[PDB]
Amino acid sequence: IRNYEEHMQKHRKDKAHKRFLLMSIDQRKKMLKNLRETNYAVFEKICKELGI
Amino acid sequence: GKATERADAFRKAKNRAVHYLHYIERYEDHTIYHDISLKFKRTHIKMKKQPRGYGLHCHRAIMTICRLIGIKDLYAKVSGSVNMLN
Amino acid sequence: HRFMEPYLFGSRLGQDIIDLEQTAAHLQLALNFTAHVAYREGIILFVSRHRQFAHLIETTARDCGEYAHTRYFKGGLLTNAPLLLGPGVRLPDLII
Amino acid sequence: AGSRLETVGSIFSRTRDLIRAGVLKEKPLWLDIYNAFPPLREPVFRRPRLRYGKAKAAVQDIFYHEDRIRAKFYSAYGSGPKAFDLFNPNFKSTCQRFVEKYIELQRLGETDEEKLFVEAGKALLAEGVTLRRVG
Amino acid sequence: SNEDLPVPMENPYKEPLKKCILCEKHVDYKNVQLLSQFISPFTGCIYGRHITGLCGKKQKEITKAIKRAQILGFMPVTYKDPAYLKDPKVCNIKYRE
Amino acid sequence: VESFASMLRHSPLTQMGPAKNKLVIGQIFHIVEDDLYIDFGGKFHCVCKRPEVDGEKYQKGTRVRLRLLDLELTSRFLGATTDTTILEADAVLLGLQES
Amino acid sequence: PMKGRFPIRRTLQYLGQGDVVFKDSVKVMTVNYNTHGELGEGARKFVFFNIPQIQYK
RNA sequence: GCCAGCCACCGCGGUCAUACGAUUAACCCAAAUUAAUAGAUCCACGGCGUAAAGAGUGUUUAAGAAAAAAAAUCACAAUAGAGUUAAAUUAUAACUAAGCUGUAAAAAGCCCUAGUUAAAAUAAAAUAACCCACGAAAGUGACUCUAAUAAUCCUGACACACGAUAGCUAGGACCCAAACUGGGAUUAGAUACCCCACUAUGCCUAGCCCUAAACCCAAAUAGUUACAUAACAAAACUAU
Ligand code: FES
Ligand SMILES: [K+]
Ligand SMILES: [Mg+2]
Ligand SMILES: [Mg+2]
Ligand SMILES: [Mg+2]
Ligand SMILES: [Mg+2]
Ligand SMILES: [Mg+2]
Ligand SMILES: [Mg+2]
Ligand SMILES: [Mg+2]
Ligand SMILES: [Mg+2]
Ligand SMILES: [Mg+2]
Ligand SMILES: [Mg+2]
Ligand SMILES: [Mg+2]
Ligand SMILES: [Mg+2]
Ligand SMILES: [Mg+2]
Ligand SMILES: [Mg+2]
Ligand SMILES: [Mg+2]
Ligand SMILES: [Mg+2]
Ligand SMILES: [Mg+2]
Ligand SMILES: [Mg+2]
Ligand SMILES: [Mg+2]
Ligand SMILES: [Mg+2]
Ligand SMILES: [Mg+2]
Ligand SMILES: [Mg+2]
Ligand SMILES: [Mg+2]
Ligand SMILES: [Mg+2]
Ligand SMILES: [Mg+2]
Ligand SMILES: [Mg+2]
Ligand SMILES: [Mg+2]
Ligand SMILES: [Mg+2]
Ligand SMILES: [Mg+2]
Ligand SMILES: [Mg+2]
Ligand SMILES: [Mg+2]
Ligand SMILES: [Mg+2]
């Protein structure tokens, strides 16, 4: 996700990567919800360390 | 049987009928052995076994065939196309 | 052919091999059935549309005293027998 | 008169049903033979459907341990100088002789294929046959 | 108990699959001779599979290698280089009849 | 009684292996003006043309030498459920049998 | 019923043939089960078959 | 005698009507009969290639499925930047020629033209390709480099992102093609097909518009070849 954002800042009109960036965020958003509902202690540490 | 004249049409149909004959088993000579559900092309016909008292409640074409076969107790429901040949 | 799968012993380098063990069982009944219908004075017809053994098969029936038909087969021969052959014709009781 | 439907059932099934029905009052002569001697499979009409999907045939390939030995001989020496004869039921081919002596040689406890192949060729040379190597 | 039945083994007579002309060989855009043999001398066109006879992998590589030399300045575009006109013939097309 | 499985193992057909490039002798059973119908022991009969040398001695029952290539010529074409056989075999003439 | 894996279980007779009557003191039933593993076969089949019968009564 | 009139639906009557009106006879209900309006009843546990029906595409939320097994892909033309040019054409120059373009046949146009030699820019990408790869779809096939193609591998909207071509707003480019327009010819007329000239525009940068026979008219994920041919086509079917 960080790599795509750096790519997006240079090539603004690129649309294939912009779709990839949005889908990557959604998948991470879906997985964070899954992690929260199973292991809260690890989810809190992951949320704090990565800045999400 | 098909011909140019109606009178000749009947004669051809009768003679060619005896060449094609089936034997239909009759449980106790009054009903089919078990309920039958079939879908011939686009015609849905369902037949159910019945006791001796209540008999011959079927399509008017089915009743004509049933009286010829010998079945005297049957219930039949026809769904979809009602074409006589099918 | 799909229906010949049970009767095939196996395939040898793409060439199918017929299981003679099943052939012997079938041939034993075939000869047994053929003789019985001939014992009861039955008409036997030899039919083979192959242009390499037509003369051999035709001579085979003559020696046995039976009938053979290795020529072109007319459409309404066995079915529409009265018109093709004659008014009253006794149909063959077995076909080979 | 009779039934002319091919797909209803076997000839035996229709004939006995019509007789039991009461329309055919003259029993055919072949019917009695059929009752005494029935075939392995009753002749019931079936539609030759074409096979689709992952289904394959059940026919097994005809391969033997001899064939593996024969492949090496054909690969190395090609076809033998002797001409194959299919008219003789008891014909012994040059490759067949090589396989037979190969089986006897390996019964002595030799496992290396190279030793088995080289010695077998030398043994055949002692019998007078020609084994000109190809290439 | 019968040892005469066939065993479930693979086919021992499987002849090795045919190799293309340039199989296991490294094509390049610098050797003009290798690339020039697959070009029509009169016109400069590139032969197809039915004429070249190469497989599906080395046919694309030759096409890409040739076009790289066209622009980089290593071989003529509209005709075959006359210096390599006497190389052995590998194509299956005949013009003289 | 010998089992059918043992018969195939020792049969000459099995010992031949692949049919390609095999020297098999055959006997002529039918003669035409230029075609020689030769039976080499296979399922079908191969057809060859009379050579220009010693062609007068190729008669019925004569034994010749053949090089089998395909046991039965058979190919598949598009739109055909079943392959169309030719009911023949492919072979070439190497000369007459050396008695 | 035509649709469904087991259309028989969606008829009045199947809903009425299950005889499990809870006492007047039972209010809430909580069922937890897993969708994987062979140990949960009894639990999953209990949910798939018997629960509609229990709720009906 | 398509007149007067009849019908619940299909229909009858246009000088030989079992349908109009009357008569004879018959049929069916019966102290009721017929007509008119409401009501009982009646659609899909059926379908979606050709019939009304799979929405242009992908992800995700709500929600729901999991239950046996098993599954991260891949030579090649994805995409977005940066640099580059073979073959053709044109500005332009020299030389020769008087004609050059155009059609079934001509006219108009040009003669500032045509042929040959020399040659930028813009635009478009022979043969390879009888190959079938990449991307979610629409799409992509001249060369080089950089960045790069989600998910440990279910379903999911009106939400988020995208979407050929034509069209709009502003700046730049213009070889060539070219709606509109003008001329020539054809025709009864030709504001059409045919011929000549030229504009919007097709192109680059930034923004918008969000439409297609966006059709492989066949939805996604797992499977089966059993059962079984409406027709035609690209065989039939099960589960969520
Ligand atoms: S067959 Fe190996 S590279 Fe062509
Ligand atoms: K190009
Ligand atoms: Mg109707
Ligand atoms: Mg009236
Ligand atoms: Mg009148
Ligand atoms: Mg009326
Ligand atoms: Mg009246
Ligand atoms: Mg439609
Ligand atoms: Mg449709
Ligand atoms: Mg949809
Ligand atoms: Mg959608
Ligand atoms: Mg959830
Ligand atoms: Mg760009
Ligand atoms: Mg300019
Ligand atoms: Mg003029
Ligand atoms: Mg000029
Ligand atoms: Mg393509
Ligand atoms: Mg996808
Ligand atoms: Mg991917
Ligand atoms: Mg989803
Ligand atoms: Mg658009
Ligand atoms: Mg546009
Ligand atoms: Mg535009
Ligand atoms: Mg406006
Ligand atoms: Mg503009
Ligand atoms: Mg312009
Ligand atoms: Mg122009
Ligand atoms: Mg005009
Ligand atoms: Mg499209
Ligand atoms: Mg659609
Ligand atoms: Mg679609
Ligand atoms: Mg969907
Ligand atoms: Mg997917
Ligand atoms: Mg699928």
PDB file of C-alpha atoms in Angstrom, chain B:
ATOM      1  CA  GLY B   1     -52.832 -41.323 -40.318  1.00  0.00           C
ATOM      2  CA  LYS B   2     -52.829 -38.537 -42.906  1.00  0.00           C
ATOM      3  CA  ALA B   3     -54.549 -38.493 -46.298  1.00  0.00           C
ATOM      4  CA  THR B   4     -56.380 -36.138 -48.645  1.00  0.00           C
ATOM      5  CA  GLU B   5     -59.824 -37.426 -47.599  1.00  0.00           C
ATOM      6  CA  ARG B   6     -61.145 -37.714 -44.049  1.00  0.00           C
ATOM      7  CA  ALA B   7     -62.697 -41.125 -44.739  1.00  0.00           C
ATOM      8  CA  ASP B   8     -59.376 -42.480 -46.009  1.00  0.00           C
ATOM      9  CA  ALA B   9     -57.618 -40.861 -43.041  1.00  0.00           C
ATOM     10  CA  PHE B  10     -59.537 -43.010 -40.549  1.00  0.00           C
ATOM     11  CA  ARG B  11     -58.739 -46.234 -42.414  1.00  0.00           C
ATOM     12  CA  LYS B  12     -54.985 -45.591 -42.456  1.00  0.00           C
ATOM     13  CA  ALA B  13     -54.925 -44.644 -38.768  1.00  0.00           C
ATOM     14  CA  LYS B  14     -56.695 -47.826 -37.630  1.00  0.00           C
ATOM     15  CA  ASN B  15     -54.514 -50.237 -39.609  1.00  0.00           C
ATOM     16  CA  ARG B  16     -51.242 -48.584 -38.581  1.00  0.00           C
ATOM     17  CA  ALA B  17     -52.348 -48.533 -34.931  1.00  0.00           C
ATOM     18  CA  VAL B  18     -52.238 -52.299 -34.355  1.00  0.00           C
ATOM     19  CA  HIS B  19     -48.635 -52.373 -35.593  1.00  0.00           C
ATOM     20  CA  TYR B  20     -47.572 -50.217 -32.614  1.00  0.00           C
ATOM     21  CA  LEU B  21     -48.831 -51.853 -29.415  1.00  0.00           C
ATOM     22  CA  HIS B  22     -47.694 -51.498 -25.807  1.00  0.00           C
ATOM     23  CA  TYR B  23     -48.436 -53.657 -22.773  1.00  0.00           C
ATOM     24  CA  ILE B  24     -49.146 -51.605 -19.643  1.00  0.00           C
ATOM     25  CA  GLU B  25     -48.889 -53.492 -16.358  1.00  0.00           C
ATOM     26  CA  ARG B  26     -51.922 -52.969 -14.116  1.00  0.00           C
ATOM     27  CA  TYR B  27     -51.679 -53.507 -10.365  1.00  0.00           C
ATOM     28  CA  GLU B  28     -54.724 -55.690  -9.627  1.00  0.00           C
ATOM     29  CA  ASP B  29     -56.050 -54.653 -13.076  1.00  0.00           C
ATOM     30  CA  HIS B  30     -57.392 -51.348 -11.755  1.00  0.00           C
ATOM     31  CA  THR B  31     -54.456 -48.974 -11.155  1.00  0.00           C
ATOM     32  CA  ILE B  32     -50.804 -48.386 -11.943  1.00  0.00           C
ATOM     33  CA  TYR B  33     -48.229 -49.858  -9.579  1.00  0.00           C
ATOM     34  CA  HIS B  34     -46.837 -46.528  -8.356  1.00  0.00           C
ATOM     35  CA  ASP B  35     -47.094 -42.793  -8.936  1.00  0.00           C
ATOM     36  CA  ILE B  36     -45.471 -41.608 -12.169  1.00  0.00           C
ATOM     37  CA  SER B  37     -44.016 -38.152 -12.846  1.00  0.00           C
ATOM     38  CA  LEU B  38     -42.542 -37.453 -16.279  1.00  0.00           C
ATOM     39  CA  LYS B  39     -41.705 -34.521 -18.561  1.00  0.00           C
ATOM     40  CA  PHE B  40     -42.001 -35.435 -22.243  1.00  0.00           C
ATOM     41  CA  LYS B  41     -40.515 -32.547 -24.240  1.00  0.00           C
ATOM     42  CA  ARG B  42     -42.604 -29.571 -23.070  1.00  0.00           C
ATOM     43  CA  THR B  43     -45.479 -31.502 -21.462  1.00  0.00           C
ATOM     44  CA  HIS B  44     -45.604 -32.096 -17.700  1.00  0.00           C
ATOM     45  CA  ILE B  45     -47.979 -34.928 -16.768  1.00  0.00           C
ATOM     46  CA  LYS B  46     -48.223 -36.361 -13.246  1.00  0.00           C
ATOM     47  CA  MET B  47     -50.223 -39.492 -12.414  1.00  0.00           C
ATOM     48  CA  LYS B  48     -51.071 -40.808  -8.950  1.00  0.00           C
ATOM     49  CA  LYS B  49     -52.220 -44.174  -7.653  1.00  0.00           C
ATOM     50  CA  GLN B  50     -55.769 -44.331  -6.309  1.00  0.00           C
ATOM     51  CA  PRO B  51     -57.981 -46.903  -4.548  1.00  0.00           C
ATOM     52  CA  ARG B  52     -60.874 -48.732  -6.204  1.00  0.00           C
ATOM     53  CA  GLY B  53     -63.629 -46.337  -5.140  1.00  0.00           C
ATOM     54  CA  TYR B  54     -62.326 -43.120  -6.733  1.00  0.00           C
ATOM     55  CA  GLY B  55     -61.315 -43.660 -10.349  1.00  0.00           C
ATOM     56  CA  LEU B  56     -60.919 -41.994 -13.742  1.00  0.00           C
ATOM     57  CA  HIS B  57     -60.323 -38.385 -12.691  1.00  0.00           C
ATOM     58  CA  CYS B  58     -57.950 -37.320 -15.466  1.00  0.00           C
ATOM     59  CA  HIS B  59     -57.702 -35.322 -18.679  1.00  0.00           C
ATOM     60  CA  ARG B  60     -60.472 -36.134 -21.143  1.00  0.00           C
ATOM     61  CA  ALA B  61     -57.883 -37.502 -23.574  1.00  0.00           C
ATOM     62  CA  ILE B  62     -56.247 -39.559 -20.815  1.00  0.00           C
ATOM     63  CA  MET B  63     -59.621 -41.033 -19.835  1.00  0.00           C
ATOM     64  CA  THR B  64     -60.128 -42.234 -23.412  1.00  0.00           C
ATOM     65  CA  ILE B  65     -56.749 -43.992 -23.401  1.00  0.00           C
ATOM     66  CA  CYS B  66     -57.257 -45.352 -19.877  1.00  0.00           C
ATOM     67  CA  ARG B  67     -60.559 -47.020 -20.778  1.00  0.00           C
ATOM     68  CA  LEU B  68     -58.840 -48.680 -23.742  1.00  0.00           C
ATOM     69  CA  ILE B  69     -55.873 -49.901 -21.683  1.00  0.00           C
ATOM     70  CA  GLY B  70     -58.075 -51.152 -18.852  1.00  0.00           C
ATOM     71  CA  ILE B  71     -57.062 -48.822 -16.030  1.00  0.00           C
ATOM     72  CA  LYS B  72     -60.153 -47.905 -14.002  1.00  0.00           C
ATOM     73  CA  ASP B  73     -58.653 -45.837 -11.153  1.00  0.00           C
ATOM     74  CA  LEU B  74     -56.260 -42.974 -11.857  1.00  0.00           C
ATOM     75  CA  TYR B  75     -55.635 -39.284 -11.219  1.00  0.00           C
ATOM     76  CA  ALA B  76     -53.641 -37.237 -13.725  1.00  0.00           C
ATOM     77  CA  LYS B  77     -52.698 -33.555 -13.886  1.00  0.00           C
ATOM     78  CA  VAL B  78     -51.332 -32.035 -17.101  1.00  0.00           C
ATOM     79  CA  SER B  79     -49.058 -28.989 -16.949  1.00  0.00           C
ATOM     80  CA  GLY B  80     -47.417 -26.993 -19.711  1.00  0.00           C
ATOM     81  CA  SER B  81     -48.262 -27.693 -23.340  1.00  0.00           C
ATOM     82  CA  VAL B  82     -51.453 -29.700 -23.872  1.00  0.00           C
ATOM     83  CA  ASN B  83     -50.663 -30.874 -27.390  1.00  0.00           C
ATOM     84  CA  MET B  84     -52.498 -34.108 -28.144  1.00  0.00           C
ATOM     85  CA  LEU B  85     -49.566 -35.842 -29.848  1.00  0.00           C
ATOM     86  CA  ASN B  86     -47.058 -35.092 -27.079  1.00  0.00           C
TER      87      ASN B  86
END
